Every structure is written in C-alpha cells, then in structure tokens.
Nucleic acid binder design. Structure first.
Lengths: 418, 555
DNA sequence: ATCGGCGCCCGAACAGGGACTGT
DNA sequence: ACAGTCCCTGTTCGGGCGCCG
C-alpha cells in the first residue's frame, strides 16, 4: 500500500509547539506507548535536526483503565492541506454511540515527504534526560488528514453493514464513528456490538467497555441521546410587585434581548421609571406596560426565524458560569444569530471542581456541534488562560481538541439563565 | 579521545541560502600565535582539516581564555553562519533541580573532556565552517581550515551533542536499567543503590563505554567523594545547598548593577525563604541606560537589609521521597509579593521560591493567591511530576464565598487552611439587592475625544446633585470618577446606578489594589462603607435618573 | 571585545479585541 | 456602518541570573 501525497497549505511551515509539563503518571504511560509504537514501525526516533514539534499528553479511556496517547494536532491541522455530506438524521435518532476507530489509521503509511511534520517530544521528570523525539510513519490519530486518507477504506468496511441496517446512521469525524439508531436501548447496544464485531473483521476498536449497563458518570460522552437535547429559553421574572430596581433590571435585560429577538420593546416599561426614584420604590405596571411585558414574554417563547447554519463560516460557542454547577452556552456564526442555546448542570463532583465542570461542558457542546453540523466550534472560555491550561488535560477524554480563546466577561449576561 | 563513532546529524542551510563569507578582523599578538599553535594541534587531533581555494566560505576566528581554566578556548564569531543554519528543536526542555533528586547510596559526577570536539559534524555541512587564519605579515594570505567536529559557538552544537550523548548512553543504560543518570550537556550525575565497591566498578564500565564512543572522562573532572559540585550546587549526602552567592557592595549603583542584583536575588529565592524584590525591581522602571546611576529609595534600602539578614544564616534543602506526600505552604509578605516553601516533613524544606507578579491593572489578594498556587503547581510537575498538597493563609469560607460569586471558572487543588497571618480576605462585599433607606445615586461622566476635558457627577432620589469638572481625562476615567463622587457624598449605606460596564466589571470583581490611583480611592471608600449596592442600566434609553445625569455631563 | 543552547525573573513595546463615540 | 480612542490582556524581546560547551 502506497502513501498518498500530502502538502501544507501554500506559504506555511510545520508546527513548532513546545511540550508542556506532564505528570509521572502520564509520562510513564507515554513512554510505554511510544516505545511499543516504534517496535511495530508506527513511529520512529528522530533528532533535533527536525525543527517541528507537536505537544503530546495522555488521557484515561472512557470507562476503562487503559491510557490513550493524545497528540495536540491543532497547529498541524491548521497548516495541513484541505482534502477534496453530513447526515441530518443523526441528530434525530434516539440513541447515538461514539466509537474510537482511530486505531485503524495506524495501518496506512504516511507520505515520507510529510512525516517531518508529525514530530513530538516526550519530556522527562526533573529534566533528567533531554526530550526524546519521535515522528509518525503511519496515519496518526487526531490528524486532520487521517480520516480523509482512510475515507476510501472506511466506506468499504461499512457498506455491507449499512445495507444490512439501513435505518442506522453512521457519521465519521476524526477518530470517532457516530452510530445512531431508533432501536430500543437494549437492542441498540446489541446493534453496536453487531457493528463492532462485523468491523472486527477489518479493524480493531478500543477494548470493550468494562461495563455495559450504563454505569453513571461513565457513559456521558459514550452513549448519547440527541433527541433529548433541550434549548435554553430566555426568561423574565414573574412578580406581583415590581420595584424601581426590578424594572431597571428588566429593562436592561429586555434591551439586550432585542438583539436576538426583533420585536422586544421596553418603552412602556421605561416610562414607569421617568423620575429619579429610590431603588426600592415599588412601581405599579400600567395597563399599557403590562401588555408590553406580556408581549415580550411571548416573543422570547417563540423560536427565532431565519437563522440557518453556514458550512463555510466557523462555529463559535460561548459559555457563562451561572453558579450552582450550572453553565449556559450559545453556538452561533454571526453575533446574536444563535444556532443553539443550551444549559448544562450537575456535572461531575458534588459541584466542587469548576474546571472539571467547564471541561465537560466544552466537550458536550463540541459533541453536539459534531452531531448537529459535523464541525467543531471555537470556544470563548470564561476562565483565566493559566487556570485552564494547568488542569484541562486532567479532565479531557475526547479524541479531538477544539480551538479556544480566553475572555474576561462582565457580569451582565444574566440574560440566559433566570 | 578519537572522534566518536556516532552518526553525524544531517545539517542543512536555510532554503535558498549560501554559506558565510566574512573576512577576518584583527587579533592581538597573544592570540595570533596561540590560534596558529592551537589550530595545528586540533588539526593533528583531527578536529580540523586544511582546505584550499575550492572552499569559498569564511568566518572570523579568535581565542579567549577558557572559563575558570588555564587552557585556551577556541571561539569563532559564527554569528553569520548561525543565521544561515537550519532551525533545530532543542531537546533540553529545562534544568534539573536538586530537590527532585532521590537519596542514593553511591553518587558520581562525571564530565566529558573536549565534548564538542569529540562529536563529528555532518560531512555535507563541513564546507560552511571554513575559516581563515590571517598571518602577522599582511603580505601573507592566511591559512584556511574547515571544521570536522562541533564548533563552540555554533547554534547547532549544544542540541546535537545533547542528542548524541543520549544515543551514546542508551546502550549502557539498557545494559544496566536500575542506575539513574541525570544528563545535562557533558556533565553526568550517576547514582545507584549498589554497594560502594560494585558502584565504582560500573563507573569504570561507563568510562570505558564512553571511551569506546570517543568520550573521555578525565580524572581532573571525575568526582568520587561527597560533597559533589553539580549544576551550580554543592550536593551533600543528605542535604543540598547553592554554591556561595556573592552580593556586590557598592556606594553608588547603576542600572546594570541593579539588573545584576535582582538576578542574583531571584537565584537565591529557590532555597532562601523570604526574599523580596518588588522595591528593587521598581528602580529598573523607565531607565534603559545600563550605566545610569540610581539612588536607592527608602523602601529599596529596607528591602536589601531583609535579604542580607536572611542570607547570613545558612539554608539547606532536602531530597525528595517518592513515598511521602508533597506539601507547599504560602505566606503573604508584601503587597503583591508572596513566598512559599515546599517540604514533606515540617521545617525540612525541599526547595523555596517566590511569586510577585501583578496580573492585571486591577486585582485582589485572592486572585494573586490563585496565581501563586498555579506557578507552584506547574513547578511541582516539572520537579517531581505530581501536584503538591497546599497549605494556604486564606479561610475556607473566604474561598467558598469568592469562587461561588465570581463569574469566571476558578479552582484550587486539595488545600488546607493554615493560620499564618496576614490572612487573605475579601475587604468588602457588594449587596445582591438594593438597599432600603439608602440614597440612590445616578452617576455618569463624559469626555470629549479631542479636547480630553470631561465632567463627572450624580443625581440622587433625595434631590441632591453634583457635577465636577476634570482636565486631562478620558471617558472611562470620568465614568469611574462619577462613581467615586457618590461614594464620597453619601453615608455608610448607598445605592449607585451606573451605565458603565467598564466601571461595573472592575468594582464587581472586588479588587483591593490597582495600578490606577482612582481605583484605589474607590476601593478604599467601599471598605469604609457598610452596605453598597451597585446597579447597571443601559445608557441612552431614557431610564430613571440615568437620563437626568446623562444630560448633565454631556453638555 | 567576542560566541552557542536551555530555564527563570522583570520591564516595556506592540498587537488584538471589544466598548464607546463621533461622523 | 465606518473609523477613531481607551483599556486591557497577552506575546516577544531586552536585560539580568544560573547551567553547560
């Protein structure tokens, strides 16, 4: 099997990303993995004459004890050439299962002229040894080009199964295979095992989940149910009595929401605050204002019209820390034209680790974007750059890594959760 | 040491470039006879070969005294060749720290002699290392040579030797998997748990193993007895310390001198607990003249006394025990300054350090504490590969009320409270609901973008008003100035309504210190108050008192 | 004068991005 | 809707320290 020629985008060099510090737990797992990959000819040792590097770290597999080597191929994927239909029914299925088929990529060799770009460096504790550098000789997991180069082989493996079960939707994104069906959960999990064993005739899958009865906290990102994803409506308070401070919070909230919902008006409400009153003064709603409020409640309940997904424009997701373990998010392409607004709560821990919360929400938001649109969004994270970077690898369990930036948001986005 | 039999690393020039063509600059007579005498020696030693007119490249050559040695070091100003050499990925990712060393029965520190001069250079690249020795008589043309080994001063030499040394040690490390060898350039920390007799046997196998690879371990650089001088430390069997620090004593100081003093004080903070450099680094602000003389401030001189005070007492570090828990404790010394000590058994510090970074223009002590915890967390991963347990001078309930009320995601790993004052506290707390029976202040401010003049005032529900004219100000400052007025002209309980997200986001973050003088005044007022409720309304929407004061300041 | 590679600290120029404002 | 100014945050490079050739 001959390798497919791969180029970088015109005028771009390879990745040169420093390796970040790793725990002894992750280095010992990585050293074992890379030493074994060199024996099977999957990687090979290189020297410092290769000026490229990509960060590597390890994650614990889903409901398992085995370790998975994860490459931060974000920079390489941005500089890799583009290659050459998304199933809209996958998001409508009852149950959807994510299968790590990244192991299949390790059977196709990579173009020699390109291998210099897959270099990574394994660090050592206390800088005992210099970094030992490796490069890839086969298609690597997490590479933008790996699913594309393997595309011809993946359709061939699945075509018999897809004709034997035409009601099952199969989408592929990077190392993961998304398998959706409308069967019952028990007959669905048997169908997943039917796909795994029929696939086993060609390429292997991650060791079967040590559990099969959905042990809680463990199949969050494994067995997904898209038909139960809910959008988060914008709500207004319901009070018998409104104060001047209460009307000001209401007017400011409605004025911000007029950017997402066209018909929002605040004029009859602002008329109630025409003086220079005390904040605690109760303001009775006039008959005209009660109607305006009642109409704004109606406007926020109806869905927004004329907002469609553009495959050429990047997706952007914003998360707000609402407190009490609750996180609100919005996915959009143009400002105030949200493609989905959701809420995630009660995540991991008894609401102790904020970072674990944010990391899970980012993964669940990305999973929805892959399932819904087949893309990944760019995240605007409500966290300090160093607070995330220090800890995020400790709670990551996806085979893909989305792009993100860090922002310090003013506390005036109370416009998403009551 | 014959040239090592290790394979050369293929080295290329940057795409579409040629080699260096630099003419040789004049040298002193002490160096001319020494370079000629040296060059024929290192041609005889094989490191250098003569070249002819077919080689069109050149690089200037000189010769300086070796660092703390009677031997001469042959150096070349390869600044032109380094710009044309390909980039490398440096495999040296950091510096080993003694606090990460475990206890060993037998320890040996080696040093390879003529390190760079033992490793061959890629044959294809040798043409570009050509140089010319100008003779004394200007009538003589001068003798041209090229390099067969790693030159000192070439940008690829450190990375290639580091990569080459690991390849040379890989077979020996595999023949003996239980011996730990800390490798940094040519210096080798060898440690084992074998008996002292059998340990010296393995060192000779290593010296013979390195000798087979053209790597001599001279006896002059072979240390067999504690104390060990390693990586600038004095290593003792159960304790470690830093080689003597010499702080300069001068009556008048310059910018450069201050730059040195800050650096040495940082280098001492790894084991000396309590080093402070904030006031000493303040003297480095603005002046880029390296030879400028700076008078020591009253606060700066006080800082030097504290450091010298804790430097008169000897401090030692302990080695690391992988079986026992890692503990770090932090204390708040000055404003924006912190010191920490990492230990396992109390009062037996592995290492110390300090964090004194001002992140942002507006911050509080709780933010800096989380910033210092992160610096220690990363540092602990580098040295020991694990996160330490923390002992912080902040109340358990103080942090609970902060991270639940802060809009950003903040987290601190497993930590326990220590009662080591001064503690970290939230100096004031904004009310969640408007205060009943509190004068409501509708504040705003404006400024012209060309004139830079502006107004700042307030209107209240009790009818009280005020407008102050300001000169040399901005829109952001006048809107901040309006909130300051309401705090001044109010009682201990006040309701303030602003239209500035910028002023609101600063105050709502509960800062206790700021680079802005005005914010420090606003913070001071909030601590004096007893209950403060700050509300925001959208501007230019005809809302309450915001509309009245908006017209007051825009005119 | 007159060198290379790494890590760290601290200070300052430059850029990016988002908000306000003026046209 | 375009183009500015302010403010903030982060990146890179300059100085110093230390290691090694």
């Amino acid at each position: 099997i001959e390798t497919v020629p791969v180029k970088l985008k015109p005028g771009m060099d390879g990745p040169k990303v420093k390796q970040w510090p790793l725990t002894e737990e992750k280095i010992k797992a990585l050293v074992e993995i890379c030493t074994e990959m060199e024996k099977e000819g999957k990687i090979s040792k290189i020297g410092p004459e290769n000026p490229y590097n990509t960060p590597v770290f390890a994650i614990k597999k889903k409901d398992s004890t085995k370790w998975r080597k994860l490459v931060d191929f974000r920079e390489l994927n941005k500089r890799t050439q583009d290659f050459w239909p998304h199933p809209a029914g996958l998001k409508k299925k009852k149950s959807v299962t994510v299968l790590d088929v990244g192991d299949a990529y390790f059977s196709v060799p990579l173009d020699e002229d390109f291998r210099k770009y897959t270099a990574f460096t394994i660090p050592s504790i206390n800088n005992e040894t210099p970094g030992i550098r490796y490069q890839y000789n086969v298609l690597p997991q997490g590479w933008k080009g790996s699913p594309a180069i393997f595309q011809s082989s993946m359709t061939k493996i699945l075509e018999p199964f897809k004709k034997q079960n035409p009601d099952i939707v199969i989408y592929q994104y990077m190392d993961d295979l998304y398998v959706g069906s409308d069967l019952e959960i028990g007959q669905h999990r048997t169908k997943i095992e039917e796909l795994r064993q029929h696939l086993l005739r060609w390429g292997l899958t991650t060791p079967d989940k040590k559990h099969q009865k959905e042990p809680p906290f463990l199949w969050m990102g494994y067995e997904l149910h898209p038909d139960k994803w809910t959008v988060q409506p914008i709500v207004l308070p319901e009070k018998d009595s409104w104060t001047v401070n209460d009307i000001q919070k209401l007017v400011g909230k409605l004025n911000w929401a007029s950017q997402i919902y066209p018909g929002i008006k605040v004029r009859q409400l602002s008329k109630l605050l025409r003086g220079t009153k005390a904040l605690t003064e109760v303001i009775p709603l006039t008959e005209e204002a009660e109607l305006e409020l009642a109409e704004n409640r109606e406007i926020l309940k109806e869905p927004v019209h004329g907002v469609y997904y553009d495959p050429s424009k990047d997706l952007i997701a914003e998360i707000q820390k609402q407190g009490q373990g609750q996180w609100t998010y919005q996915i959009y392409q143009e400002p105030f034209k949200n493609l989905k607004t959701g809420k995630y709560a009660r995540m991991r821990g008894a609401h102790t680790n904020d970072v674990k919360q944010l990391t899970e929400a980012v993964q669940k938001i990305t999973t929805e974007s892959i399932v819904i649109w087949g893309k990944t969004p760019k995240f605007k994270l409500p966290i300090q750059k160093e607070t995330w970077e220090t800890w995020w690898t400790e709670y990551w369990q996806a085979t893909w890594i989305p792009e993100w930036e860090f922002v310090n948001t003013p506390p005036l986005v109370k416009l998403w959760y009551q | 040491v014959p040239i090592s039999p290790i394979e050369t690393v293929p080295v290329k020039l940057k795409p579409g470039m040629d080699g260096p063509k630099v003419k040789q600059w004049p040298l002193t007579e002490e160096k001319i006879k020494a370079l000629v005498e040296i060059c024929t020696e290192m041609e005889k030693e094989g490191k250098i070969s003569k070249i002819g007119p077919e080689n069109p490249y050149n690089t200037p050559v000189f010769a300086c005294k070796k660092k703390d040695s009677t031997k001469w070091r042959k150096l070349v100003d390869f600044r032109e060749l380094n710009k044309r050499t390909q980039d490398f990925w440096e495999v040296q990712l950091g510096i080993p720290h003694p606090a990460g060393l475990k206890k060993k029965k037998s320890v040996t520190v080696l040093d390879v002699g003529d390190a760079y001069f033992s490793v061959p250079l890629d044959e294809d690249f040798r043409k570009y290392t050509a140089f010319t020795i100008p003779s004394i008589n200007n009538e003589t043309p001068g003798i041209r040579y090229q390099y067969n080994v790693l030159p000192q001063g070439w940008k690829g030499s450190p990375a290639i030797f580091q990569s080459s040394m690991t390849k040379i040690l890989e077979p020996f490390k595999k023949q003996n998997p239980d011996i730990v060898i800390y490798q940094y350039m040519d210096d080798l920390y060898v440690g084992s748990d074998l008996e002292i007799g059998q340990h010296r046997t393995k060192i000779e196998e290593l010296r013979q193993h390195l000798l087979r690879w053209g790597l001599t371990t001279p006896d002059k650089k072979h240390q067999k007895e504690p104390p060990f001088l390693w990586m600038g430390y004095e290593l003792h069997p159960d304790k470690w310390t830093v080689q003597p620090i010499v702080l300069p004593e001068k009556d008048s100081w310059t910018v450069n001198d201050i730059q040195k003093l800050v650096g040495k004080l940082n280098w001492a903070s790894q084991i000396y607990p309590g080093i402070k450099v904030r006031q000493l680094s303040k003297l480095l602000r603005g002046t880029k003249a390296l030879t400028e003389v700076i008078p020591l401030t009253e606060e700066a001189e006080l800082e030097l006394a504290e450091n010298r005070e804790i430097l008169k007492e000897p401090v030692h570090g302990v080695y690391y025990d992988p079986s026992k828990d890692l503990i770090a404790e932090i204390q708040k010394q000055g404003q924006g300054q912190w010191t920490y000590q990492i230990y396992q058994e109390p009062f037996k510090n592995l290492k110390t350090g300090k964090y004194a970074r001002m992140r942002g223009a507006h911050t509080n002590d709780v933010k800096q504490l989380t910033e210092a915890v992160q610096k220690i967390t990363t540092e602990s991963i580098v040295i020991w590969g694990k996160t330490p347990k923390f002992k912080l001078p902040i109340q358990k309930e103080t942090w609970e009320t902060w991270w639940t009320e802060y809009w950003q995601a903040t987290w601190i790993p497993e930590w326990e409270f220590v009662n080591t004052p001064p503690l970290v506290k939230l100096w004031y707390q904004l009310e969640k609901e408007p205060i009943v029976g509190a004068e409501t202040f509708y504040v705003d401010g404006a400024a012209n973008r060309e004139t830079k003049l502006g107004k700042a005032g307030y209107v209240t529900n009790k009818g009280r008003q005020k407008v102050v004219p300001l000169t040399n100000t901005t829109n952001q400052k006048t809107e901040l100035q309006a909130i300051y007025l309401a705090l001044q002209d109010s009682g201990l309980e006040v309701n303030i309504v602003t239209d500035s997200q910028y002023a609101l986001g600063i105050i709502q973050a509960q800062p206790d210190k700021s680079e802005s003088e005005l914010v420090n005044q606003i913070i001071e007022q909030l601590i004096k108050k007893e209950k403060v409720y700050l509300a925001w309304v959208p501007a230019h929407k005809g809302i309450g008192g915001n509309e009245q004061v908006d017209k007051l300041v825009s005119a």
